[PDB]
Each structure stands twice: as C-alpha cells, then as structure tokens.
Amino acid sequence: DQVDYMDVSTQQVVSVGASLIPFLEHDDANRALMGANMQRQAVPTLRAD
Amino acid sequence: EFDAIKIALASPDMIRSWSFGEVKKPETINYRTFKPERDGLFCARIFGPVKDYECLCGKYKRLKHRGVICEKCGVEVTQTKVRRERMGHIELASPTAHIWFLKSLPSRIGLLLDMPLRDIERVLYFESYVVIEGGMTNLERQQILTEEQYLDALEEFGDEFDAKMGAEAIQALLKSMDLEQECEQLREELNETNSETKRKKLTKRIKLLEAFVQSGNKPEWMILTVLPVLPPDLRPLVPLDGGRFATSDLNDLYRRVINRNNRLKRLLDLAAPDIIVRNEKRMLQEAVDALLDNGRRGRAITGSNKRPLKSLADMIKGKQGRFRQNLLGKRVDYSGRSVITVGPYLRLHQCGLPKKMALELFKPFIYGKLELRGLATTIKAAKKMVEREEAVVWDILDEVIREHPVLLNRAPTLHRLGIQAFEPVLIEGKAIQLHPLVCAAYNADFDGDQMAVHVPLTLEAQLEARALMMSTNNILSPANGEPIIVPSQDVVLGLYYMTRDCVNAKGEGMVLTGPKEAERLYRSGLASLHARVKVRITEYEKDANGELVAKTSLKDTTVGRAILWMIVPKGLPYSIVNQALGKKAISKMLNTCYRILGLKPTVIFADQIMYTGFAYAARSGASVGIDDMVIPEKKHEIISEAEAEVAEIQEQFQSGLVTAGERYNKVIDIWAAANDRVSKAMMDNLQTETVINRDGQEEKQVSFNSIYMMADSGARGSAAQIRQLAGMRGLMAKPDGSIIETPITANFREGLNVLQYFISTHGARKGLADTALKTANSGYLTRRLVDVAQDLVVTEDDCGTHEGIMMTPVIEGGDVKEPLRDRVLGRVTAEDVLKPGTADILVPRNTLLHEQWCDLLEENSVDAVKVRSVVSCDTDFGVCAHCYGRDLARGHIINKGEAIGVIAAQSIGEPGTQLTMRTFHIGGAASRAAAESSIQVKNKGSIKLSNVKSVVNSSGKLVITSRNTELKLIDEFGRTKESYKVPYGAVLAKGDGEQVAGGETVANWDPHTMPVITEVSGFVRFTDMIDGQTITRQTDELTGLSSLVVLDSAERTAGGKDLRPALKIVDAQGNDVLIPGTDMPAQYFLPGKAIVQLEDGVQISSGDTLARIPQESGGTKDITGGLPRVADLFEARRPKEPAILAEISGIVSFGKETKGKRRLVITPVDGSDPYEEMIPKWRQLNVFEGERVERGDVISDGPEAPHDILRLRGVHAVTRYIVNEVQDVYRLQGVKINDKHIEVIVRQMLRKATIVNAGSSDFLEGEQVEYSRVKIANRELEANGKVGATYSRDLLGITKASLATESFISAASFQETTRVLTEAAVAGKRDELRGLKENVIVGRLIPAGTGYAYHQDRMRRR
RNA sequence: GAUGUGUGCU
DNA sequence: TCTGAATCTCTTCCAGCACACATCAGGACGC
DNA sequence: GCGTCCTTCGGAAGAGATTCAGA
Ligand SMILES: [Mg+2]
Ligand SMILES: [Zn+2]
C-alpha cells in the first residue's frame, strides 16, 4: 500500500552496451565491464552471424 | 677521461668565455629560403654552419677549405654538428636577478643580505627602494623605502647618498658586502646568544657564508649581467607541411627576452622618462624570470590557447625532463615488440622469435655473414638481398641466431625477473612464444599483452645474458628463496588429477613390477590413473658424501604417482609424489630438488614436470559445468538466523543500547560470521560429497568435483572466489574503504537482483579504481626506495665483527607465523649458539647456516640466534658478504660486487604494486576479519603475562588496565608456543603461571567499545563537565537518567578548549582517594566521543566500567588500504601522539606544577641530573614518584616514534622495530619477503650522524655529516694518540636520506631538481661519480656487477 | 616536437 | 616581553610500456 | 592571399615564515 511507483523494466539500470550481454546477472561486474568494452571493440567479420 | 663533475656559479666573464657571439636580434629563420638571420637566435656567424662543410654565403663548399673563416658573411666552415656545442650570450642593458636564487626556499639572497623575501621582491620589481650607503642620516644599510619615503629622504637629505631600486641595487648590496667580517660578526653573535631559533638562523646564515667563501663563488654572481643562450640544435625549428614553422617555447622566451632587452637599450640612449624606463626594466626582469623558471612567479606566461610554455627549468626537471626521460631511461636500437602466445613445446632457455622480426633485429649480423661468405661485395648489395628476403638469407639468420640470446622484457618491470634472456627459436608467425614457467615471474598471461625483445650486441653483453640474465639461472626469487618458476594453474591441475586416488579402479588389487608397468597399464586402458596398487620402486639417496645408494622396496602408491615417479631425478625420496600434489607440494618438490641435487637437474625436472602436467591435464577433460557448483541446502537457514540477529540489533539500537557507530560494526560482524558459516557449509558439502562403493558397500572420499579440484589443487581459485559461486557473495567495500552496510545474499549460480548487482558494483568499481588510481603511490614507493639504496653494493668479504641483531620466532597473536628457520635461513650468525646442553657450542661463529644447520637448530629447539645484520656492519661505502648472508637467488653466500641495495628496494617495492594491481580478482569482497572477542588457548601449558597492571573484579577475577600487555602461553618445557595481545579493559578468567587445559577461554572482552575501567572504589564527581560546553547531554525525563557524550575537539567551543572533562573518584567524606602504592588522586580523563551510563555520585567497586569509547575501526584491509603504513615507516613520520620515553635513566620525581604542561624531573644516582621534560596534560604517566626507570622505558603510552627508539634504545632496536612493522603489514596480505631487504633499507636510512663535540677532528659543533666519514676520521685519529669525535645517529626518511646524499647528480635526478641544483651551485659541490645512478647518467659501467672489477682497477690505478 | 582524446596489459 | 609551540603559507610529489586519431605552429592589419 | 610584428576546483606531507602565549 505504501508504494506509489515501479520500475519499467529490469533493463533500465544498465546501458545499451551492458544490456547486450546474456546472463548479466551471473557475471562479476568487473567481467561485465570488460565484456561491455570488448563488445564495443569488435570488428565486423566477412559474413555476419 | 674524467673522474668528477663540478658545479658552481657562472661568472659573467665565464659566460662571455662560453659564448661564441652575442645574439642581439629577435629573428629566427626568416620564413623564406631556410637561412638564418643576421644576428638572431639562429646565425651561421655566431653558432655554426647550417649545412655540413658549406659556407652560408656560397664561397666555401668542401673539406679542402676546412677551418677558414669567410669574409662575405663571416662564418667559419666546419662540421654542422657544432651548432649544438657553441653557445651565445645576451648583454643585458640592466642587471637581472636569477629567479632560482630568489624564489627557491630558503632564498639565498634573502639570508645573504639578511632581508625578508617580501622586501627584496618588492625592491627587484620596482615597488620600493633599498637604502644602500645610508651615510650620515637615520637610514640603515638595508632599510626599505616606498615612493613617498624616498621623496622625503630626497627633499630633506638631498646629499650624495643614493637609494636605488631594481636588480642593480641588489647587485650593489651583494658586491658591497664583506663576507669574512660578516661571518666573524655572526660567529660572535651566535656565541653570545642563547635562543634556539636565533641560534639556528645564525648558523644557517653562517653555513651559507662559509659555503660562499670556501668556493670560488661570489655574492654578486647571483645577479645576471650576461644571459647565455642554448645552442640552436638543442632548440630546433622543424619545418612542417607548408611555409610555417614549429611552435618552439625556448625560442619564444628568447624572443621575448631579446625584445625587452633591445627596448630597454633603446630607451637608455634616448633618455626616456623615469617611470617608463623603470617599467621596461621590470618587464625585462619578468621576461628573464619566465625564461629561467616559468611559473615560479605569479602567473606563468602562455604561448597559445592558455598553456604555459616550458622554460629552461621545465625541460630539466620533472618526469618529462632530461633526467628521467632521456638519461635514466632511453630508447634503444635492436629492439622489437609483439604480443605473446604460449608455445608450451619450448624449454626453460628458449623463446619463439617471429621469423620476420629476427630478420629485422639481427640485420647487421646478417650483413656481416653475407659479406663474409661472399654472396655480397658491398653493404648495399647485402642490404638489398636482405630486403628481398631470398632463400639464402634465412640460413644466414639461422646461423647468426643459434646461440645469441635475446632479452624479453614486459612493460612493468617490477622486479629483476621482468627481464630475462632466452635462446631464440625461429617460428613462423608474429607472436613471441613464451615458456609457460616464466609467466609467473613476468606476471604475464596471454590475454593481449606484449613483450619487448632486446638484442645483446657485444660478447660481454651476450655472456651477461647467458650467465646472469638467462632464464635457466633465474629459478629462485631474489626476494625470498622460494622457487619462482613454479607450475601454475594447468600443470598443477594435471599433477593433482594424476597423483590422486579414488576407492575403485579398472584394476586396484593388482601389484606391479615398476613404474613402467604402471604407465603401460594406464596407456593400455587396463588400470585407472587413480588406482591404489603396490609398485616396486628403486629410489636413490645421497645420505653419504655424494653417493647414490639404491633402496628397492614395495610401497602402497597409485598408478598416477608411479607414472610421475619416472621423471623425478635420482637422489630424491619417494615420499614427495606419494600424495595429492597441489601447487605448494610441487613448489616444495622443486625447492628440495634444487637444494639437494643442483641447478641442471632442477631445470630438467621443471621441464619434465611441465610436459607431464600438460599431457595428463589434456588427457583428463577437467571441464567446468553448471552442475559442478553445488548449492548447499541450508544457506537460507543461516541467512534467516543472521537477519533475525540484525533485527534484534536494530531494536537494540533504536531503543538506545548502542549508537550509530556501533550498529555498523556489529552488523558487519554478524554478517561476516554468517558468510563464513555459509562458506563452511558449502565447502563441507563440496569437498567430501563423493559416496562411492569400495567394491562392496558405500564409502566416503575426497570429491572429484571440478570446482573443488581446481580450488584444492591451488590451480586458480580460493575459498573466497569459489564461495561466491555456490555459497553467498557476502558484503562489498566502497572506494573510500568503508564496508557496505547491507550484504548480498546470492551467488553467481542463481541470479542477482536489479539491486544486488547495483550494490556489488560499488565494490567492483572500487577494485578497478584502486589499481589505476593507487598503484601510482606504490610505484612512487619503489622509485624512492631504489633512489635511496641505489649506491649500496657488496664491497668486501668480511668486516670482522661480533655484533648483530637477535632473531626469534614471531608469535604476535596466533600460532607461529614465521618459525626461527624462516627468519634465520641463509644468514651468517654472530656468536656460537648454545644448545640447551649449555656451556657447549652448537655452531661456529662465522658459518653461513644453510638448511642442514637450520635442521640442526630445530632439532635442539633453539629459540634465539644472534645473527649478523646489514645495519650493524662495519664496512665503509658498502656491505660485506658475511653481514648480508645468502644471495637468495642461488644457494651460496653473496658474491663480492653485487648491487644488493637495488634488489632490496625492488623486493620491498613490488609486492605492493603487484597486489594493488590485483585487488579486483576477489571482485569487491570486504575481506575483513570477524573481530575475534575471546582468547581460546589451543595448546597445553602455563601462562606468562608481560607488562600487566591489573586489579580485581566484582566477581574476584582479574581485569587488565594496561595498554601494551601480552598473553603468552608457555608449555611444560619452558618455551613459548602461543602468544596473544590482550586489550585494555579486558577481563581475565585465568591468571599467570597456572596450567590451562587446551581449548578453553582465558580472556574475554568486547571487540568494540573500549572501556576506561578504574582500580579503586568510591563516588564519582562530574568534574569539569557542564551541559553544552564540553558535553552533549540528553535526558530521558521518564527514567530521569542522563547519557552525555563528551564532544571532541571539533564541536567544542574555543573558550572551553582548556576545559578537561574527567571523573574524580571520591569517598563519602569528600576526600580524594589514592591509587595504591602512590600518592596521586584517582583522576581519570575522558577523551572525545565517549559515552557514560553512570550518574553523578554513584558508589562503584574496584575494576568496573565508568565510560565507553567506540572504535569505528572499519576498513576492507586490502594491500591498498594498508600501504600508507609502509610509506610512513620508511619515511619515518612522527605519529600524532608519540609515546613519551625516558631520555635518561634515574630516579623520577616531579618539581614545579602547571607550566601549562606538567613537569617531570629525572635524577640519576651518581651522574649529573640536568634533565626536565614538559609532559602535556593529555596522557597519564605510567611511572610514579618513587620508581626506577631506564632509558627507553615508556613514561607514557602510545605509538612509538622511530627516532626516540634510535636515540635511546639503539640502532638494533629501531631496525628490529621497522623490520617487524613492515613484515607484519606485508604478512597480513600473505606477502613473503626476507628481512635482509628491510634491514638494507634501514641501513640506507642510517647514514647521517650529528656531531656532539668537535674533539681533535675537523668537524663542527652541530653539523650533520655522513656517518661513514665520521667513522673513518675517528678510526684514523684513534690510531694515533688523538681523541675521536663523539656523534649521534640520525634517522632520515627514504626521501630525505636520498635528497641529502653527497652526490648532487643523484639528488637532482631523483626529486626537486631546482632546489638541489641551487644548493649545489651555491656550495660549489663536486660530484665523484660513486653510485649507480651517476654512472648510468654519465654513460659508464655501473660499479655494481661485472663493472665492479673494472671500477676497482680504475680506483686503485690513481 | 608538444598538446587533446580514445584504447591495451599490468 | 623574549622565546619555544602553534599556526599560516608556499612548495613539490602523485607507476610503467605501447597503439590510433587530429591540431598547432602569430592572425591583424597594411598592402 | 603575402608579410612584420608584440581562472577559480585534489590531497597528504614538509619546510620556512609569521604569530601566539606564557613565564
Ligand atoms: Mg595481462
Ligand atoms: Zn660566406
């Protein structure tokens, strides 16, 4: 009864880069940071998959 | 060539002698056909020819006209590289003050003319006058006149007396001053005066005067008359794309100076008005100051877009100057750089160079052999052949790369194992394959890091790489004798899966005829690797004088251990593989192999271990799944218990039982206990959860779970990281160091909330910020440790001393952290140690005691060996081999000529850096203790309480009222086996000297809320505490009870600052009770933030709590929070509240009362008694009116400053204190460092010795001169009948002890280049090039290793 | 050559 | 009211190697 | 186009200058 608001979705705390990591709730947040940065660093391959 | 570097002030005549011309136009290259101007900053006539052996005008063009001077433009034809060797000068129209000798503190001009810096600064910048030659008036020789006072003195004293402003007046003051007469007048005044501040100021000015008069310097040389200019090739103008030119800063500053000088020169000829010419002189002064040291004045001038251009000092000082960027470390040819891969097929002396990189590194070597074999006739043909990469070039490369070791260096070269030499093995690729064993030494994984290749060129360099820097000769860490090429994280997993047993197999009851049979059965698939069979194994032993005698037996082993036995070299017992090998087990195996057999069998054993670990880790498929992280079935019950406890804690706190600084501590403690209980539950559910039949019924065994396998084997993981996977994650730590109030109750096998992840991010960002933002202040520590101990090398073999420090096992709160063996291994003893068969010697005096002697000492159970230390050595300029000990990288005594001061500094300085760059491997876990509250004695024995002042309890027991007490457990034999530090106000369930059963509590207390318990009984009066002024009080009117919290120095009023709240214990009749045995009333002070639950005038007993003091000790206790302490110990910072020690022994009594602070008089029984000490009212005194004290005994309590210890308890006490403190700090993190390095650093901290009396020597009264020189002079004088000079050792921090050395080059290259060079120029110091940094800067062989013999030959040659 | 930004491994 | 103690103010220090990109370099006014 | 020219803001420590107070 005391509540008066609620978060829209579970994705609203993370950014657009850290929200592309599957199973983010199981990684250590240092590994989440490194995964986000490395995912930003990827070069497009010959055939997209 | 040369043997010294002398620095001094530059006279104007000498500056003109340096100059080859006079720059007098502010014009660089004319932005045209690239030729210099007439007499600008670039000039062929002044500095040198632009083109090589070509005249500027176009008259002389070849070497056939060398040496002649042209006539059309007057430029001599010579080599064009003389443009960086011929300086110029600028004839300043007016004198200008040197900013280095004005605004560097203390100002040389300021304490040479005895004027304050403000007055001379206003005089120089034309804002006031100074009275030179006052004459027959009321004006002194240094008086400051403003404009109005100057006009008044002109109108009413318009005689020949003159008073000038600007640098001309200061130069007149300096030139008109006599130095010897002033020095003798100052000596007279110093002998007359008695105040210490005046004495110090006068002796500082006397020292400046003596430095000026002894050297060839003159006072008037600190005011510039001619300003030299840098040679043009050292300030080049590189043409960019187009007609523009590069933005040079020195050229801009020179142009500004020349513009101002020419404008002043023009105004001096046209008789400009006085204000204009004075303003122009001020502008010239500002321009020269900006040229010399920009930014030391008010505003640094900027070139473009608001950035200060660098002056002649900004490019000589700092991290980006000619000292730390181009002299102490340079860029090198024959070097390369690429990423690294594993290539585990290699050997310990091999690496993989890419085939296209070794061709470019060894290119001149290929040229030489191509010309030798005749395939080319010139260098260009061979160059083109190598460029084309023909089929014959690769064979030449193979021939030249055969036994030419290269140096592989990783980017942070923390310790000396970061540079190692490998024999290259050419590979096809672009990545440098690196042997998996040296990855621990390099601290190099294979996740994208690069290593640099360096090619030793000369024969001496190749042999230094093969005999010293070779990776084969680097199997022991130089910090501690533990091996450094240890199998890690895959070889240990292979050797742990191999050497293991489960109770079943393909064949278990079979009995084999040898290890070959076991390997044949495993490979043929007829027996599992974890069987329990009986193999017949022939192990050798060298118990004789080097003879291997075989002993064949039949041992109960496994198949895996029998297979592994085929690689163990002959000479080692079988009881090293007949167990479950982890990482420590095989590290010990390699260590004992090296200590028994030697180096070559150890290296071959390491290679074979790596091969058979990789093979049998591949053959196992030791994967990791999601079902391997078995969640315990009782975690949430432990969660519920702890949350109920926290709810009760909240209900107690809100009622008012505890404050908000104690709720934090208790909730952290209860959640840390719950986390440990959950971790224990999951570990018990993991380690033993393997119910397997014995071929009959069910049986228990150690689990084969993959997570538990790689956690127990020590491969990669621990209890923390594995706990966070299947137990609970726990509670995090903020970047500031504070622990998070709320814990995370989920692991990384279930999910995390949208909020628990947010909580974890605090610790996760703390871990990543800590590295990148606080490894700077740990690289700084090792830099200023290296720069203070760089010049310490082993220069002798034995000084012949019986002195040395005492070594005992360190038991300071638990079990034996380091036994005597670890603290005494490989160090030469100082006296014949006596076993408890006393009056008989056990070891001789000067024996380097190795592992056999350590075993002998432990057999007889010795508790104290007096060992020789570095700090107590008697050598001069270095240490002897016996006073240092073992090399710790090889199993022998330290060789003469070894740079031990750099090895010590690196060894101390890079566990901190490495472990602060690895704080995020635990994520962001709190890693704090559980705040143990009671003492549970595990062993059996009696108790001995040291330095205890205890009284009785209301129940009759003992309560401790002493600060530095220690509860030590002594067994039935008489040796100490356990020790504990009990705190103030802790009750005792048992006493001293009584035998305690093993496993019961003795001392109980509260981990927080230290009490102020009394020792007598009576009523208590609230003395000097009134509401609002010194106490914050709140009263519950329902109960009528008051709970006042005395404020700290922060919120206390300034008027009530002298009010001291305390509790006077009084009896019924208003009389002051007495402390038993003394006559002082029981007055007990209360510090800030203290709460008292008692009312005013309540009867009490003996030994009860009157007030409570919260502790608020909250920290993550990593190596990041915990290493400003090492910096404080090494810099010798005095603590906030020093413990008052006794300066002189004797009877202690009090004299006069309340001189603001209490007075204490110590009177000896025989000698003089002149000593009185001012004790502040802050701390009580542990001594009374009728006791006996010795020097070093503590009058008060608190942290000991490491200067009183030095000056009272001696050198051994202070070095032992520093060693113990640093060792405790490092050992808290698991760091293992031998104490030789800390002793070396302490010795380097102990090199200054203030003279007490001159004696027959030539030293002064209170001069601070090097201790080595004092010892040499005293030993030389005591040879004759003369009496030596008495001194007093000084302790300086690692910064001051490096900045106050005798060589100004090392001090200038370390820190404060301007301040060091200013003092060196004033004093006229002369460097002797004696250390290692000096010879590195100069460009010679260091007098440390292979250059030590050459330097000895050169020194004894002259 | 110096700045400014981004990045990699410690 | 002279001289240690305390406070105020100025100064110097803040890890290592490497890679990529762009921008600057007098720009205002006379000619 | 050629061409001569004239902001503030961290933070611990140490030294050296004032400034206090206290006998
Ligand atoms: Mg790495
Ligand atoms: Zn010429």
Ligand SMILES: [Zn+2]
């Ligand atoms: Zn010695």
